[PDB]
Design a protein around this nucleic acid. Structure first.
Ligand SMILES: [Mg+2]
Ligand SMILES: [Mg+2]
Ligand SMILES: [Mg+2]
Ligand SMILES: [Mg+2]
Ligand SMILES: [Mg+2]
Ligand SMILES: [Mg+2]
Ligand SMILES: [Mg+2]
Ligand SMILES: [Mg+2]
Ligand SMILES: [Mg+2]
Ligand SMILES: [Mg+2]
Ligand SMILES: [Mg+2]
Ligand SMILES: [Mg+2]
Ligand SMILES: [Mg+2]
Ligand SMILES: [Mg+2]
Ligand SMILES: [Mg+2]
Ligand SMILES: [Mg+2]
Ligand SMILES: [Mg+2]
Ligand SMILES: [Mg+2]
Ligand SMILES: [Mg+2]
Ligand SMILES: [Mg+2]
Ligand SMILES: [Mg+2]
Ligand SMILES: [Mg+2]
Ligand SMILES: [Mg+2]
Ligand SMILES: [Mg+2]
Ligand SMILES: [Mg+2]
Ligand SMILES: [Mg+2]
Ligand SMILES: [Mg+2]
Ligand SMILES: [Mg+2]
Ligand SMILES: [Mg+2]
Ligand SMILES: [Mg+2]
Ligand SMILES: [Mg+2]
Ligand SMILES: [Mg+2]
Ligand SMILES: [Mg+2]
Ligand SMILES: [Mg+2]
Ligand SMILES: [Mg+2]
Ligand SMILES: [Mg+2]
Ligand SMILES: [Mg+2]
Ligand SMILES: [Mg+2]
Ligand SMILES: [Mg+2]
Ligand SMILES: [Mg+2]
Ligand SMILES: [Mg+2]
Ligand SMILES: [Mg+2]
Ligand SMILES: [Mg+2]
Ligand SMILES: [Mg+2]
Ligand SMILES: [Mg+2]
Ligand SMILES: [Mg+2]
Ligand SMILES: [Mg+2]
Ligand SMILES: [Mg+2]
Ligand SMILES: [Mg+2]
Ligand SMILES: [Mg+2]
Ligand SMILES: [Zn+2]
Lengths: 58, 103, 112, 218, 159
RNA sequence: GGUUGCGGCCAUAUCUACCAGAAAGCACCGUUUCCCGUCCGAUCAACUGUAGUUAAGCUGGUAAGAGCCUGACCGAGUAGUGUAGUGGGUGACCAUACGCGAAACUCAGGUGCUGCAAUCU
RNA sequence: GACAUUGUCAGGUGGGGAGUUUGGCUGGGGCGGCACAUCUGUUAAACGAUAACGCAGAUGUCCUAAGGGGGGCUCAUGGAGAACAGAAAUCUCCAGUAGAACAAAAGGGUAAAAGCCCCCUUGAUUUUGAUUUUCAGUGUGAAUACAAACCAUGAAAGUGUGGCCUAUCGAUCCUUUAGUCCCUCGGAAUUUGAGGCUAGAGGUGCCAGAAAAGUUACCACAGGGAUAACUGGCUUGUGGCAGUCAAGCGUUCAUAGCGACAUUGCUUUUUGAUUCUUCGAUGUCGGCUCUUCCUAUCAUACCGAAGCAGAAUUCGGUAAGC
RNA sequence: UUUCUGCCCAGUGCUCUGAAUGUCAAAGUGAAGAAAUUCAACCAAGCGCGGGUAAACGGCGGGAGUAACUAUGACUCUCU
RNA sequence: GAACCAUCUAGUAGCUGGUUCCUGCCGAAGUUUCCCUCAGGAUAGCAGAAGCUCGUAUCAGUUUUAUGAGGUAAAGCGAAUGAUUAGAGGUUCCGGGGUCGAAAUGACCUUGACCUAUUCUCAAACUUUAAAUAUGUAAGAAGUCCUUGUUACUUAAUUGAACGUGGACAUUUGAAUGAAGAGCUUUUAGUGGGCCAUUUUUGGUAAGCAGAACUGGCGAUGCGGGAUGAACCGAACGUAGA
RNA sequence: AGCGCCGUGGCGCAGUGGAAGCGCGCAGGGCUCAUAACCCUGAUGUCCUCGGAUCGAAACCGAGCGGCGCUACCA
């Protein structure tokens, strides 16, 4: 009682029905996987920039 | 394999927190105590009629066990464990290999 | 079935142990023959030869067992039984060479 | 005991040569590939006649040996032993497999059928193409009418269609007849055991003059 | 049984080349990668550390992270019925800059120069590229180019 | 332009055989107290630039040179190949239509270029 | 006679009896094998993916160095030499792009090294995170790149989170070890004991992990033509039959009759191969009986050929009427 | 009915012996502990050891060489 | 080969059979992973429904330009590895024979190897080279340029890195074509036996045989044709007329 | 066909990485009038062939050759 092992028939049609959406990209991507020494400084840099602009347009 | 009886490695003993000397032994499992909760539950379940109530393993397939070294920091007596790969023969005694010797 | 296999494992192991046991008494009685009794000496040689041939056969079966048969648990006792069979084998070999050597043959005359 | 050639006529499988993955093949039945006056010089036999395939198929080594023996015997008997040089320009390297099934009654009781059907080497064949030369024979012009008949007799031992073509080349070379003639009237040819080496304008002038001195003696 | 390892079917892919074996030249280490650069992936068999998987050979991605000896690249992998983003940490020996990106940047600055120039004249720059238009009319003369008549050739053996 | 230090591309740079090399520079070269290393001051280390030599290294040139590199409407639009037909052929396979398109071969040409710093008749 | 007996616990014996089990894949099942967890090359059709009981092989280890760092050197082989010494001992020179070695299978990779020798070492360490492969973007295994420490080596740049890279392995429950010596034992305390938290080990190879022997020719049920044993159908290896060629046999002579080495076919009266139909049944070997059909003709009719004198015989044709 | 029922107790069973460094449960005894408890020693039968038993279950060889023709092998060697 | 009667009992069944009105709209799958899993499930996929945020775009089973990657087809072996045909010229202080020989680091000839230059034929697990078809990315407003602000990161250093302020560059805003609305979420059915055709392709002598790759189909689909046929050719369907 | 075993002196057989032996035969001498028996000695091998791993094996791992034994069932 052998049977079919494997096929890829109809799979591309199934995928291209409502398929091959490219992932939505954004401004400001996620900073995980980035160097922690870079993130730890970028936090302080952004905080200082925000404080400087707030003192500028207070 | 051959592992030396001593090894200089890290010790997280709250006073060392650095690489100190360590005396290396081999880990043995220790006698399984009675009055452990699982043992009490097992005796209670095995008592009476019904026979053996839990599975008992038969289909042994490994030939080896992973060896575990118990390291003893010589300063603060902190003990650590680290496992090695599976080896058939194991040795703590240091008979170091020499290269240019005859058979 | 692994059960039938380990049954014949245990059967051969007890047969090997009693073969070692009735080899060792023949060995010590060979050493205590009082060598004046040369007939009894040769009888003891030919008697332990049969036992070591029986153990040799058992050792070949242990060889095949450790090679192909998937013993799966008892490599240790099969190897220790094999080591005992072979040490009895070289014991018999020392005995049999000691009796086979001749007192004025060239092998005796070169180096005592 | 051998299967008919129609079971292995066509190139259905990839080339399957004897290698370090076979290690157990039957040796080829054809062994001699060059015959006649094989030590004859190049200008002794100008004319070259080819028996060339027209199918993409496989020629068995037994058929090659049979056709070789046929043409050799005919031309040696009715033209002399040393009037031609024949060369088989195919070599059986493809190894034919057979999945031998039992021919007894109740063979299905112990046959297993198509399970593990991978065959065993039992033959050798040469994979030919459209316009691939099978036989090439070089002679003088006084032997043409009989070497054509020898190749025509050898053609019956082969499956498929083969053509007999008179080549415009001088013997077993690659040059045409008048090109070789105008090359050999000068000293830029130099005979070998059976073939001929040519002078090129490339290379060291010392060795080029050491050989072919008649071309440089202008 | 079947075999699908990390380097299955990588025999010719991770071969080095003909006659450029050995160590790699120093420009690969001297090149500077920044976050947002577009880089191509081509693995080097001489460097076994930080290799990409065989799927990413010849793939082009965007840098998102720069480390001591490696580079983080974002690839779009086709899985099922969608693409997923895959973050790869690759040593720079497997990485080269994409030339199409810099050639686009030169086109950008050239278009900027054209616009800044012709803003002073108002001559309708027409900065877009255009495909190969069909060729327009021309008059070809026969002076020294009288047409030479050709004919099909008969069949011949040529062996 | 030569040379030295550090290089980039890594044979147009390599290999084989000869010939030449002002100046300077490199080099060979001379010594073993010291630091140092060897069975061996040969290599390595140190010292002198003194006693000498372009012999070698190195650079350049030569060779119907090998190799390598570039190009060709040289092979060849060939082999192969995407697409099409109720095309051919018993079949094997092969033509045609719209397209893409090699490799070997042959011929011709070439045989390192160049960056930073210093120095030289 | 205070022993037997009787009562309750404890150990042994106990197919006499009770209950249950007695893998999967599979060109039917069984036997065989593992294609069941994995690795290399190929099949695989130049991204990736990709099957068969496809092909050629391999794994359940081994290593305190065969790991890490640094320094020095160059290997296989060949040639030419030197007492004993020769084909092979040790020493010297030249050539040597790797033709060697790198634990193992194969494939990549490596030459002032990744190889060989020497020096020092434990980074084969700690804390958790992110990412790649298999992939459901789950787990496991393996691997990658950083961060925070502590270290090793080296003049230093640097390199080092095991093995140059691709394989070398394991959940819940339970037990046990290490750490915190931290939390709880719930009327309040102290000490044992126990239970918890974090990180490992003890193992499931049918490898995402049941605790498991057979037989039924006395058999039963649910089903299956997803699946065999008849026919039928495709195919024709095998069987049978027929050709083509012509080395030779036939005293002489290839072809009267034959005919090797080869090669092209036909048939479905052989046996296979397959699994399409049929398992809510197509009554299954042979014989008897009875009819018809085919020709690849044994006889009979008429002919042709012969190594046909006659006789007998052999080859072949029209022929299935009988 | 008659005539006979050969060899094998190694295995599997069955059965006889128990002086015992064998194994050896519960109860009991001793030591430690503050106790729960732990560790010892002792430890019946049975296994184990040692005998018997096949009109119990059952089982009851292989290869060479060898006699004035050949054959065969009374005979011999060896494994067992 | 464990009677009969009643009850537990409507015992369980991954298995067989059946499953009751019409019309309208949309519309599949026989594939991935895991399971004592292979006649079944879960999971992802395909499908429906409910919609929600917006209003022509942060698109596309497509091409072009530019730029990568590959190791198949082909080709090659007087290029490596391996296989392989035939001679030629040589070398033996150094293969085996004989001859002249007492022998000689002696001579002649025979035959084997080793080298040189050639020559014939080859490779799924060989290769220098190397396509066609397929395949990745980019073609800008989330962009470019100028100036100078933040940092505990980095540099010898206001040196760079990242994110910024302010200013400038707008409809040819950075190739073509098309967009039928674009994007997003929830929930759930059925399916998880497939089969056929062209082309590539493995096993097999072959098979209406078994097993893969791409695409298109049948299943789920009628219609005209192929007399006849699930798949082929043509063309896909509301009811009618021309 | 599959699986498993075996292949060693003239015959029957052992044989584990530092590496070939047992018995009977065979040869020599002795004893005996002589032959056996007996005594003292000696010799004996392509370890089936081929390749590989190892610094090295008959042994380890592969290719075949030869001979044996087991299975080949449900209809
Ligand atoms: Mg299925
Ligand atoms: Mg499968
Ligand atoms: Mg109780
Ligand atoms: Mg109880
Ligand atoms: Mg059948
Ligand atoms: Mg490549
Ligand atoms: Mg590593
Ligand atoms: Mg029972
Ligand atoms: Mg089954
Ligand atoms: Mg691929
Ligand atoms: Mg190493
Ligand atoms: Mg080094
Ligand atoms: Mg993972
Ligand atoms: Mg580090
Ligand atoms: Mg616990
Ligand atoms: Mg565990
Ligand atoms: Mg599983
Ligand atoms: Mg039963
Ligand atoms: Mg039955
Ligand atoms: Mg039965
Ligand atoms: Mg069926
Ligand atoms: Mg047939
Ligand atoms: Mg036939
Ligand atoms: Mg059927
Ligand atoms: Mg039926
Ligand atoms: Mg029916
Ligand atoms: Mg019916
Ligand atoms: Mg009927
Ligand atoms: Mg007829
Ligand atoms: Mg009896
Ligand atoms: Mg008994
Ligand atoms: Mg008995
Ligand atoms: Mg007790
Ligand atoms: Mg007792
Ligand atoms: Mg019911
Ligand atoms: Mg399970
Ligand atoms: Mg069904
Ligand atoms: Mg492209
Ligand atoms: Mg490939
Ligand atoms: Mg090819
Ligand atoms: Mg080529
Ligand atoms: Mg070659
Ligand atoms: Mg679903
Ligand atoms: Mg589902
Ligand atoms: Mg259906
Ligand atoms: Mg249709
Ligand atoms: Mg069409
Ligand atoms: Mg009409
Ligand atoms: Mg004698
Ligand atoms: Mg005598
Ligand atoms: Zn400590």
């Amino acid at each position: 009682a052998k049977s079919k092992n494997h096929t890829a028939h109809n799979q591309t049609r199934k995928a291209h029905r409502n398929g091959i959406k490219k992932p939505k990209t954004y401004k400001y991507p996620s900073l995980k996987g980035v160097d922690p020494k870079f993130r730890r400084n970028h936090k302080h840099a952004l905080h200082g920039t925000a404080k400087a602009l707030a003192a500028a347009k207070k | 394999v051959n592992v030396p009886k001593t090894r200089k490695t890290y010790c997280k003993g709250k006073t060392c927190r650095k690489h100190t000397q360590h005396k290396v032994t081999q880990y043995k499992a220790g006698k399984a105590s009675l009055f452990a909760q699982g043992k009490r539950r097992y005796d209670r379940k095995q008592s009476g009629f019904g026979g053996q109530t839990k599975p008992v393993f038969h289909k042994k397939a490994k030939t080896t066990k992973k060896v575990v070294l118990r390291l003893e920091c010589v300063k603060c007596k902190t003990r650590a464990q680290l496992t090695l790969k599976r080896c058939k023969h194991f040795e703590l005694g240091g008979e170091k290999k020499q290269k240019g010797q005859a058979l | 079935s692994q059960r039938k296999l380990q049954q014949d494992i245990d059967k051969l192991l007890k047969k090997v142990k009693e073969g070692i046991e009735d080899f060792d008494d023949i060995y010590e009685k060979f050493q205590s023959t009082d060598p004046s009794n040369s007939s009894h000496r040769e009888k003891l040689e030919s008697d332990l030869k049969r036992e070591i041939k029986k153990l040799q056969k058992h050792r070949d079966q242990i060889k095949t067992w450790l090679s192909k048969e998937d013993v799966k648990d008892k490599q240790s006792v099969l190897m220790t039984n094999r080591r005992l069979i072979e040490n009895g084998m070289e014991r018999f070999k020392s005995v049999e060479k000691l009796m086979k050597t001749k007192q004025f043959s060239k092998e005796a005359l070169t180096n005592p | 005991a051998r299967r008919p050639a129609r079971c292995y006529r066509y190139q259905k499988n990839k080339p399957y040569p004897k290698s370090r993955y076979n290690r157990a093949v039957p040796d080829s039945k054809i062994r001699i590939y060059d015959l006649g006056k094989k030590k004859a010089t190049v200008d002794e036999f100008p004319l070259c006649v080819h028996l060339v395939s027209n199918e993409l198929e496989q020629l068995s080594s037994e058929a090659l040996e049979a056709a070789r023996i046929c043409a050799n015997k005919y031309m040696t008997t009715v033209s002399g032993r040393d009037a031609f040089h024949l060369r088989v320009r195919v070599h059986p390297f493809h190894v034919l497999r057979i999945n031998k099934m039992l021919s007894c009654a109740g063979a299905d009781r112990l046959q297993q059928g198509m399970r593990g059907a991978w065959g065993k080497p039992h033959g050798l064949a040469a994979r030919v193409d459209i316009g691939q030369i099978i036989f090439s024979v070089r002679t003088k012009d006084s032997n043409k009418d009989v070497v054509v008949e020898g190749l025509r007799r050898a053609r019956y031992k082969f499956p498929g269609q083969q053509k007999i073509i008179l080549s415009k080349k001088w013997g077993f070379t690659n040059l045409d007849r008048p090109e070789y003639l105008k090359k050999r009237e000068a000293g830029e040819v130099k005979d070998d055991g059976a073939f001929v080496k040519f002078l090129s304008k490339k290379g060291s002038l010392e060795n080029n003059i050491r050989e072919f001195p008649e071309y440089f003696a202008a | 049984g079947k075999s699908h390892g990390y380097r299955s079917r990588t025999r010719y892919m991770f071969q080095r080349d003909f006659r450029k074996h050995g160590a790699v030249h120093l420009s690969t280490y001297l090149k500077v990668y920044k976050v947002g650069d577009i880089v191509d992936i081509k693995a080097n068999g001489s460097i076994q550390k930080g290799m990409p998987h065989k799927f990413y050979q010849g793939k082009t991605g965007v840098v998102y992270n720069v480390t001591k000896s490696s580079v983080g690249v974002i690839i779009n992998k086709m899985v099922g019925n969608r693409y997923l983003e895959k973050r790869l940490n690759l040593r720079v020996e497997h990485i080269k800059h994409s030339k199409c990106r810099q050639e686009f940047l030169e086109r950008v600055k050239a278009n900027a120069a054209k616009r800044a120039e012709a803003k002073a004249q108002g001559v309708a720059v027409q900065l877009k590229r255009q495909p190969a238009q069909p060729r327009e009319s021309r008059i070809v003369s026969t002076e020294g180019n009288v047409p030479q008549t050709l004919a099909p050739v008969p069949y011949e053996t040529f062996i």
